[PDB]
């Protein structure tokens, strides 16, 4: 049998959130689900929507409704996106990707996962053409990582051995090299 | 399917509450819902009402009932408002609004949201006429904020370009100016 | 729809309880409800009763049952009252009331609520006649509080203007005087 | 209506448990209930049984099953008792009782409850004959407690006034003497 | 009646997890159950699967789906095993077992349980033949433990008295020797 009901994800909109809160992009997934999918009455949608909000973000929702009583939940979410959503230039998406380097004590397979989230944003905002993202991924790994020289021998084969690797192919080759023998 | 049942909001009435408690004005929303809407028996209403109370506030509820056994939940909430509700002069509503200035490291869009809660109280208590609240909002932002001079050029257009802006219009113009370019 | 099920109130019987526990007089309300009202089987009553106990208090319940297998839940609660309940002389109820004075930084309306719990105990235990409790309340407020002199002018009217005030009447007159004007 | 479902009691088997865990003798009550009483399918019994285990204790359960696939839950609990249960000589039960004295700031009624748990273990393990446990209780209270001399006058009546008192009789006489008068 | 629904086990994939998280080998049991057994719709499986993930591990799941929309839950778990699963040579399994010695203040029955988890891994990965695991267990206990000399007399009988003992037989003989007499 399906286990315990799952708690709502949550969001404050604060300049420094609590470590249990989500990104706006993820709270907006839960909110889009509640709006589009749930078989529920409007005031019960609105009480489930309201129950997820904290911080400053809870405080906007009342102001917007009082000034327009005809507001649907589909319209109220459009006001919520303007105040708490995100604005970022093409140049900022591009510069924020290319500046990313491996940290102290971070593993190479941890770095290559962290770096892949930034490459998707830069391809959405048309900063990088989708035609060349697999070449741009390999060039940035060899630029930013602290590769051991047996790993260096393999990545230099992938650079030359036909087309550039996919994400899961590159991630496999890295994992085979990360393992150490005990003493 | 609708997710986990939602916890009751809570209130102590203490001089310093726990950071999880609500304002009396919000606990009184939950209490007004339980009183007016829920399809429930009186002793079960009263056990749900009681379950939300803590601090000193829990302690009043017994005293009031013993001295009048005929008391309805509609009458018991009227006694609760007298002891824990709020009293504020017209002059205090007006002075408490006009004294409000931007804090250290606070953003201009955070300040303009914080300031809008105070303008609604002052218009309820008839301190500010509802006829002029959109003019009074722009005059207080230019008085209290630490505007950069490219933002200053735009707000001085809004001051002259016909009628004064609404809340969401002003909030849009501010957000377009707050964003910075990376290096 | 009625919201989430409510957690059991709890009791340790310890010399210093955790701050989440209740007075014995309140845990005994929940226990009296479970005994008298719930439509449940005996071993399920006894498992709900048991689930609320902690500290030393949990440890008594087994000893009492082993020595008398015929024990009903109505009889087992009578043993529980003897060991954890309260004993207090008429003279201690009277002296513990009359010694009560306003604390550092406590408000007058907070003091007059705190003092009313003690006057009910002293009238149950026949230390104070129920005929005169409204006179005894006003005499103790003027004895124990740190009244400002505009409040002093009003309470000295109530002392002379016919019969002494009720609890909610006195509490109204105090609240009208507690409010301050901003600068 | 019966209130919220009750959380499982829990057990680690560790040399120092968390303060929320039970004695093995109490986790084994919950486990005996799940085994004998619940109207449930075997793999769902085994998933409820498993869900209560932590620490080292969780880790044994897998090893035992792999080496004998025909194992019933009635047989698997017999292996669990051998590794985490308790072994104690007749002489250790007797010596551990007789050495028990009142602590700093402990009340006499708290001591006489704490001491009664130890007398039951010593009568199970046949160290003390059940024929004489009420005499042995009074002799140990007068040996171990720090009695005031008005309490001393009453316990010396109980020693001589026919048969020795029961547990609840002795506990009543002690409670009547513990109370103090205010000043 | 079966008690409260049980919380999901959880996993971050982080280099240092929170102390409430499981090993990947145990989160993968819960995930294999959800995939194979639960009578549920695909998007509700995927929302239950997703709800258990945190840390870096939550972040992989989106990337994999976007690059192949035809992916089943049976295929998505195969990608999850490659990135977060475990790689270990035959020589590392063997060396990691044989190096294991008793710690400061650890009991002999606690050591012999801790050591048995390592012997199962080394027999899965074909480092130790299953034909001889009961001999290899006794040789490692006499090598690694700090045995008292009355325990030494008994284990030297088991070494010679026909076939080597099973796990529960050896664990019984150790437990009979660990107990001490009070003073």
UniProtKB/Swiss-Prot annotation, chains A, B, C, D, E:
Q: Which UniProt keywords apply?
A: Acetylation, Nucleus, Tumor antigen
Q: Where does it primarily localize?
A: nucleus
Q: Name one GO cellular component term.
A: nucleolus
A Gene Ontology biological process term? positive regulation of apoptotic process
Q: Where in the cell is it found?
A: Nucleus, Nucleolus
Expression across tissues is: Brain-specific. In some cancer patients, specifically expressed by testicular tumor cells.
Q: Which residues form a coiled coil?
A: none
Further details from the record: Antibodies against PNMA2 are present in sera from patients suffering of paraneoplastic neurological disorders.
Would you identify the family this protein belongs to, as annotated? Answer: Belongs to the PNMA family.
Descriptive protein name: Paraneoplastic antigen Ma2
Specify the species.
Homo sapiens (Human)
């Amino acid at each position: 049998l399906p286990m315990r009901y799952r708690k709502l994800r949550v969001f404050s909109g604060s300049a420094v959130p609590a470590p249990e809160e989500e990104s706006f992009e993820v709270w907006l997934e839960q909110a889009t689900e509640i709006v589009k999918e749930w078989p529920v009455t409007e005031a019960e949608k609105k009480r489930w929507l309201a129950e997820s909000l904290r911080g400053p973000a809870l405080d906007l929702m009342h102001i917007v409704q009082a000034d327009n009583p005809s507001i649907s939940v589909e319209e109220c979410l459009e006001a919520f996106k303007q105040v708490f959503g995100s604005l970022e230039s093409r140049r900022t998406a591009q510069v924020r990707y290319l500046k990313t380097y491996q940290e102290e004590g971070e593993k190479v397979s941890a770095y290559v996962l962290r770096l892949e989230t930034l490459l998707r944003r830069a391809v959405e905002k048309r900063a990088i053409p989708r035609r060349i993202a697999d070449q741009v991924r390999l060039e940035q790994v060899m630029a930013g990582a602290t590769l051991n020289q047996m790993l260096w021998c393999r990545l230099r084969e992938l650079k030359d051995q036909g087309p550039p690797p996919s994400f899961l192919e590159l991630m496999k080759v890295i994992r085979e090299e990360e393992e150490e023998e005990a003493s």
